[PDB]
Design an enzyme around this catalytic site. Structure first.
Site, mmCIF file in Angstrom:
data_model
loop_
_atom_site.group_PDB
_atom_site.id
_atom_site.type_symbol
_atom_site.label_atom_id
_atom_site.label_comp_id
_atom_site.label_asym_id
_atom_site.label_seq_id
_atom_site.Cartn_x
_atom_site.Cartn_y
_atom_site.Cartn_z
ATOM 1 N N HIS A 28 -9.978 1.156 0.003
ATOM 2 C CA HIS A 28 -8.524 1.112 -0.067
ATOM 3 C C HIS A 28 -8.037 0.649 -1.425
ATOM 4 O O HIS A 28 -8.167 -0.549 -1.717
ATOM 5 C CB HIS A 28 -8.002 0.127 1.001
ATOM 6 N N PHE B 186 2.316 -3.095 4.661
ATOM 7 C CA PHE B 186 2.785 -4.360 5.176
ATOM 8 C C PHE B 186 4.313 -4.392 5.098
ATOM 9 O O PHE B 186 4.903 -4.070 4.068
ATOM 10 C CB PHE B 186 2.206 -5.518 4.370
ATOM 11 N N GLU C 83 -1.944 6.099 13.361
ATOM 12 C CA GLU C 83 -1.720 7.291 12.554
ATOM 13 C C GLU C 83 -2.134 8.566 13.276
ATOM 14 O O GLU C 83 -1.421 9.568 13.251
ATOM 15 C CB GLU C 83 -2.473 7.218 11.223
ATOM 16 N N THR D 107 2.522 -7.069 9.524
ATOM 17 C CA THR D 107 1.268 -6.520 9.013
ATOM 18 C C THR D 107 0.752 -5.406 9.917
ATOM 19 O O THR D 107 0.165 -4.439 9.447
ATOM 20 C CB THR D 107 0.165 -7.587 8.894
ATOM 21 N N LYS E 202 -10.940 7.260 1.876
ATOM 22 C CA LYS E 202 -11.138 5.835 1.819
ATOM 23 C C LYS E 202 -12.490 5.438 2.412
ATOM 24 O O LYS E 202 -12.993 4.326 2.229
ATOM 25 C CB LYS E 202 -10.033 5.100 2.590
ATOM 26 N N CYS F 99 0.766 -1.226 0.000
ATOM 27 C CA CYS F 99 0.000 0.000 0.000
ATOM 28 C C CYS F 99 0.804 1.286 0.000
ATOM 29 O O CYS F 99 0.187 2.362 0.031
ATOM 30 C CB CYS F 99 -0.940 0.061 1.224
ATOM 31 N N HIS G 88 -3.710 7.969 5.889
ATOM 32 C CA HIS G 88 -3.707 6.598 5.374
ATOM 33 C C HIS G 88 -5.072 5.994 5.754
ATOM 34 O O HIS G 88 -5.780 5.448 4.924
ATOM 35 C CB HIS G 88 -2.560 5.779 5.933
HETATM 36 C C1 CER Z 1 -1.980 -2.432 2.583
HETATM 37 C C2 CER Z 1 -2.106 -1.728 3.969
HETATM 38 N N1 CER Z 1 -1.895 -2.514 5.171
HETATM 39 O O1 CER Z 1 -2.376 -0.524 4.020
HETATM 40 C C3 CER Z 1 -1.031 -3.632 2.807
HETATM 41 O O2 CER Z 1 0.298 -3.128 2.956
HETATM 42 C C4 CER Z 1 -1.094 -4.618 1.654
HETATM 43 O O3 CER Z 1 -1.358 -5.807 1.876
HETATM 44 C C5 CER Z 1 -0.788 -4.228 0.207
HETATM 45 C C6 CER Z 1 -0.360 -5.508 -0.550
HETATM 46 C C7 CER Z 1 -1.533 -5.934 -1.415
HETATM 47 C C8 CER Z 1 -1.451 -6.015 -2.740
HETATM 48 C C9 CER Z 1 -2.740 -6.471 -3.442
HETATM 49 C C10 CER Z 1 -2.913 -7.964 -3.127
HETATM 50 C C11 CER Z 1 -4.137 -8.399 -2.804
HETATM 51 C C12 CER Z 1 -4.327 -9.889 -2.513
#
Ligand code: CER
Ligand code: CER
EC number: 2.3.1.179
Lengths: 411, 411
Positions: free
Chosen positions: A339, A399, A313, A269, A334, A162, A302
């Site tokens: 998201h 993540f 945050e 995470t 959002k 993200c 965020h």
């Molecule tokens: C998003 C967040 N926690 O704000 C997190 O970092 C995340 O999992 C992004 C990775 C996802 C990519 C799309 C995959 C979906 C299965």
């Protein structure tokens, strides 16, 4: 010293297929969340998402060329074209070499991976498409755009979950500032509303489950938060060096004046209750821009509507803004949009840029009852009118505790 | 001005589990190619790859923690640890903030994606692992490393197919040079030797099919080339600012003095017969370093053993080196090792660095009969001894015409 400015915007999103339409929907507090109908969701704990509605691409991409492309690439290109058209740049042989691209995605082509794997499970390896690889890998949005416009400058793709959106814009400016490029197309595209993407985040218990009221599911900072809401889309920016832009008489939307990165070093995470990583990235952005927290009018948060995430945050904002924490505006778009994962930071950069243009701050809808200690001005239900706002800050966390922030300035 | 130097090496590869072992195998012209035995290959057109043999990680990663991780992340971490240990850095609270990571992958966790998708096909969405997302997404190698060593500096991950390796090193230096970090862990990890990765590249007709002699399959520039040979692995570098490194008394392997990026703007998978994109990236690296082609002693080529691909790079070398094209040494270690995709540029950066240390140039094995117009010194069968070599160039090209080059200098 090279100053980077934003001369072109382009975007596909759940509330709109163009920049201006999307912006009106956000300011009018519209939601883009809806029931998923492209796959049976009966066994799923989440049956809704922020989907791109009535998307056409035939004018831009041919049906024969559509088949070599996962939907995330399709979105990226269409939004990229928009950004180029808005930019008005003319690419010449004397130009090609100095224009590049910096587009990423969180996971890229989940749709086509699932499809190919299905074929392989049911027909062996001879049923796997010949375009499997180039139709799914994350960097193909920049690949196709470079080819399409004959771009020969730098071509990178950052894939930081993200934070992708923010990182691609960040490094696109850095590249330009360094001298490797004069113009950079930057942003992110994502299309994870697929069985594996919905199931997968469900598996982690990270998604909201409010299927009885899909449009109320996403509620950043509300006491009844239960998880983020998934959304597809893409947002593209055209970044270019000031002087270059000046000489060509370009629509200058804003100036990219600060970019900060940070690491959490806590959980894979989960964010720290503290928000220290988020704090150090805003902090670093501030230093890079050379301004104080007090000059920030609006923070595009965020704020993903997750219990732990939203707490952190908020705290990080209290640490950074301190006394000006009550005078600063912090909203999460959002609440409406959902998201966008890899695209989140890209579209939200556009929202922070437009806010400068119009001096209007999109709201955080669904914030009926703030939880215990959140005393900040979260722009609760309706768009807020403002005056004399020079800078806005834009956050994105991800993540692996990978953090990033971008500071925009009105010109 | 900030000068970046390489103070730490770490690596897993098909010919070795450590840096030094791998290096001996390459100089002795050993091959790492072998028959795949972890999945039935009866229906497959390629039954071999470059696999990491007898890999242990239990000392570094626990069995309970192994389950949240695709093998590509496993490789990345283990090699990252190596690099940190080799570096000898001590991370303190007064340090954390200035040390970051810049690790990528071409596709990341294919293994776990296929596994989860299988479970979903056979048991519905409740059988999808809760770690599906964080165990597969490309940026989790840097995520886990930052957490493990408490790194709080910048955390990015570039995913540009086979250029990933080079790009992560490039931007890690740029970051350091800019002032955002003092130390950066950079490199790439890949583990695509899976049904979908083997099938998928097979589908495109991009892989060699010489199953009767697996170790002879990979033959860059040979007249009987039929496709690249797939290989798994990871190579990590520790980059740090000169002065910082000087004061701490660090093993200085080399200095990163040049980094060039370019775009092809031709085809999505195919390179231009010309090699113009490859040419402009070496060219740009040269400018960035401020040296002339003639100072380059050795070029670690992209040279993947593909008919069209090998032609193009050779031509690009003739364009850049011109008259010094006959005096420059160009080999491909992919003859032994195979193509590491996202990791290729990382391991090959280590080979170009060690060549400076030892003044020995790894060979291009299997080059029995060069094709028609390749008159360059390809270091044909045995390692070549050299004297007074100050600089080496390192190439990596990728799908979407994304190109990159790194120039190293002996200190
Ligand atoms: C998003 C967040 N926690 O704000 C997190 O970092 C995340 O999992 C992004 C990775 C996802 C990519 C799309 C995959 C979906 C299965
Ligand atoms: C590598 C090359 N042509 O040198 C090419 O760019 C590529 O396909 C890298 C992307 C692959 C990632 C690993 C996925 C395997 C299925």
């Amino acid at each position: 010293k090279r100053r980077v400015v934003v001369t072109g915007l382009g975007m596909l999103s759940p509330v709109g297929n163009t920049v201006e339409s999307t912006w009106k929907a956000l300011l009018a507090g519209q939601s883009g969340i809806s029931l998923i109908d492209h796959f049976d969701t009966s066994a799923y704990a989440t049956k809704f998402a922020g989907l791109v509605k009535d998307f056409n691409c035939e004018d831009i991409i041919s049906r024969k060329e559509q088949r070599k492309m996962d939907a995330f690439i399709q979105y990226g290109i269409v939004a990229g074209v928009q950004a180029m058209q808005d930019s008005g740049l003319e690419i010449t042989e004397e130009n090609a070499t100095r224009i590049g691209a910096a587009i990423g995605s969180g996971i890229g082509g989940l749709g086509l991976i699932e499809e190919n794997h299905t074929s392989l499970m049911n027909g062996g390896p001879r049923k796997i498409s010949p375009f499997f690889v180039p139709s799914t890998i994350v960097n193909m949005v920049a690949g196709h755009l470079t080819i399409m416009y004959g771009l020969r400058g730098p071509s990178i793709s950052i894939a930081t979950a993200c934070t992708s959106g923010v990182h691609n814009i960040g490094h696109a400016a850095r590249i330009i500032a360094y001298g490797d490029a004069d113009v950079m197309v930057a942003g992110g595209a994502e299309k994870a509303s697929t069985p594996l993407g919905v199931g997968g985040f469900g598996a982690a218990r990270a998604l909201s489950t409010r299927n009885d009221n899909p449009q109320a599911a996403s509620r950043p900072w509300d006491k009844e938060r239960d998880g983020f809401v998934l959304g597809d889309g893409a947002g593209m920016l055209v970044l270019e060096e000031y002087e270059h832009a000046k000489k060509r008489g370009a629509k200058i939307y804003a100036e990219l004046v600060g970019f900060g990165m940070s690491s959490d070093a806590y959980h894979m995470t989960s964010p720290p209750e503290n928000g220290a990583g988020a704090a150090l990235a805003m902090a670093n952005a501030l230093r890079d821009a050379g301004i104080e927290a007090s000059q920030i009018g609006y923070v595009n948060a965020h704020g993903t509507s997750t219990p732990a995430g939203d707490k952190a945050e908020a705290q990080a904002v209290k640490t950074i803004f301190g006394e000006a924490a009550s005078r600063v505006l912090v909203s999460s778009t959002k609440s409406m949009t959902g998201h966008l994962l890899g695209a989140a930071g890209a579209v939200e950069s556009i929202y922070s840029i437009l806010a400068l243009r119009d001096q209007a701050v999109p709201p955080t809808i669904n914030l009926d009852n703030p939880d215990e200690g959140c005393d900040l001005d979260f722009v609760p239900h309706e768009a807020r009118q403002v005056s004399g706002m020079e800078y806005t800050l834009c956050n994105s966390f991800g993540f692996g505790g990978t953090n990033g922030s971008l500071i925009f300035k009105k010109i």
